[model samples]
Target: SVVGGLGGYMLGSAMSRPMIHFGNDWEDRYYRENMYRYPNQVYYRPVSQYSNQNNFVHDCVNITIKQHTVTTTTKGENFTETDVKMMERVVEQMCVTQYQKESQAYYDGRRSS
Candidate 1:
């Protein structure tokens, strides 16, 4: 499907955009339509399996967790909202450790004082 093949917006912010652009009107993502094309990446949910990894033709959305008390709900004892909620119920149960490690890393970097 050639549908919605446009590249992501806010790429600059993701790149840690500087406070000021050095142009009268800063423009980005401009391309030579006839000579160039940016490819789309297929991103998927975090997983730890080998064979199941090929199941990439399904829906996947990129999200950012601002680093919070995710480990608590990540355990998801009572079953809750968002992926933490859904993730607890998923079969593989692989995402929990990965989430914890990333969160721990986030806190660690700030504490490397």
Candidate 2:
């Protein structure tokens, strides 16, 4: 049991921690801010910045899903808008679940912290 517990902890830790590669300028900007000004974090980089979209790879965990939209067709006529989250890194990504009633800023702030 002790060995199993340790193994589980190790696996979960590995899964929750990830490395992120910023391929685009927008992604790099977001990543730099997230690495530095991540409020309330116990410890983080004091400073981070980017100048260009140079090929660079950085390690990160707790990756975030960027805001996006999802749409589908019903009966080949009606259209529906729903959100989704993606697994694995790819050109394809899905919208994170959100509430229409809440303002965008409010939702983003609430989630980030």
Candidate 3:
């Protein structure tokens, strides 16, 4: 129906539009460059960069798992090397999905304009 199509367009517009929130000009430039450079992905910025022990180790492991290919168990607890690789692949595939969504939105906008 036309009503359903209208609702879907509104939802997609809200979801796919880029947002900007930065304190200063340098921060704005950095974020804008990062957006175009990385497209549909966002990098992790951990709370405490220095903490590789205790409470922070788990977060560090998760963040590392997102960015790099892990072959060893390393600091991740309970998970084996195989588990780490499996989790990494899942994250990578998720990024591919994100990229596809963004690309489709981008082309749609271009055609609309």
Candidate 4:
């Protein structure tokens, strides 16, 4: 499986995405792809443990309290929808952090405060 192969590579090598283009377009694409590549909608239920952690081949999704909250009727809960939206902003910050050597704003901010 492509996911399994990627997972193996990830474990063997600490892979990291530098967050180059953290624009709205990129976030939309990333989130959409994330859902598409792995179905299991959060509308009815968050996901199965195995499937959530790994790809859908696992057949289950796991919810942890560290980042998820218990919902009586709701499928699930996490860093509010607001914070999830902020992921894009955080991605931008990460991008700035990564290429701070090239971005004057990043360096200037770092020196100022």
Candidate models: Cα lDDT each: 0.26, 0.22, 0.37, 0.30
Stretches of candidate 1 exceeding 4 Å from the true structure: 1-92
Lowest lDDT sum, 10 consecutive residues, model 2, at: 38-47
Highest TM-score among the candidates is held by which one?
3
Rank by TM-score (best first): 3, 4, 1, 2
Ranking by lDDT: 3, 4, 1, 2
Leading candidate by lDDT: 3
lDDT of 4 by residue, 1-113 (tens): 22332221111122233333345776656654442222111111122222232332121122212112334214543445543444433333333332322233323655863
Return the clash pairs for model 1, or none. none
- Candidate 1 per-residue lDDT, tens place, 28-101, comes to 22112211111122223333332233241122222211111232234542322433322222212223333334
Off by over 4 Å in 4: 1-77, 100-113
What local lDDT does model 2 show for residue 3?
24
When 2 and 3 are scored with TM-score, the better candidate is 3
The TM-score obtained by model 1 is 0.21
lDDT of 2 at 53: 17
Model 1 Cα RMSD, Å? 18.5
Name the runs in model 2 displaced over 4 angstroms: 1-7, 11-21, 36-113
Candidate 4 lands at a TM-score of: 0.21
How far off is residue 107 in model 3, in Å?
3.5
The C-alpha TM-scores of every prediction are 0.21, 0.19, 0.30, 0.21
